[PDB]
């Protein structure tokens with residue numbers, strides 16, 4: 001029986017918001033079965049809880065932001081990427097401020113902190129959302145699709161009109177029943193361009209943004225002295241973002257995601273269109289993990 005997982009132990013990190021550049025304390029706690037993942041603004045009296053679910057996404061400009069009233073939890077995509085990759089159904093995430101800390105710009109630190117604490121299998125079937133039908137969303141040249149597939153698999157393609165890809169369109173594709181999220185995707189850092197410094201300045205964005213937590217690019221140059229973690233880092237990071245944004249469904253996907261330049265917006269649109277077309281999906285468990293179309297790392 002594929003069982004639900006929580007954290008074995010509590011996890012504490014410190015960091016800054018990429019967008020707010022604020023110091024934030026982060027705590028992840030176990031939660032009981034069918035809790036799902038709930039963010040908690042503990043710097044407010046009363047404490048303000050936003051379940052990590054598609055309906056709660058409010059802004060998707062340069063991050064996925066959870067909103068309940070005038071209250072946001074900004075930039076959830078990387079942590080939720082990590083928590084999906086390791087298969088966590090149930091957790092309380094406590095933040096002392098509006099934004100998850102960026103750490104190094106990838107999910108590496110999160111997967112490491114989580115696996116150090118270890119996971120706890122809980123005595124209840126894990127619910128899975130299976131794609132039964134193709135589901136597609138477009139807006140101009142951006143496109144995002146769910147396709148039935150016995151497994152979980154994430155394709156992504158983007159053309160940047162940017163010198164730094166030395167001409168080439170970035171593409172990649174990963175079967176997570178074949179390949180490790182931890183080795184191949186988790187270490188892929190977020191990234192930004194100096195040609196956007198004005199606009200970002202004019203939106204009060206990327207205030208915590210530096211070489212220390214992001215691949216920074218000035219025309220022909222990635223400024224990061226030590227370069228990249230993979231030749232295809234940028235596109236592997238878009239796959240990390242998609243895994244996080246997708247996990248706001250509140251259950252794991254049996255299916256294939258195909259992204260063509262899709263951002264946080266179009267990812268979230270795809271979730272909504274999907275939830276809405278109940279013909280296109282069903283919830284399933286597996287009484288025998290030995291015949292499931294996906295598996296997970298030992299807890």
Ligand SMILES: COc1ccc(-c2cc3n(c2)C(=O)N(CC[C@](C)(C(=O)NO)S(C)(=O)=O)C3)c(F)c1
Nearest residue numbers: 062063077190191192193194206209210214216241
């Ligand atoms: C000195 O000049 C600088 C210019 C720019 C930046 C800078 C760094 C970042 N920026 C801006 C930004 O918007 N980020 C988030 C990127 C996205 C939205 C993402 O990963 N979301 O999860 S992405 C890859 O999907 O498009 C990282 C910087 F730090 C310095």
Ligand SMILES: [Zn+2]
Nearest residue numbers: 077190237241
């Ligand atoms: Zn990202």
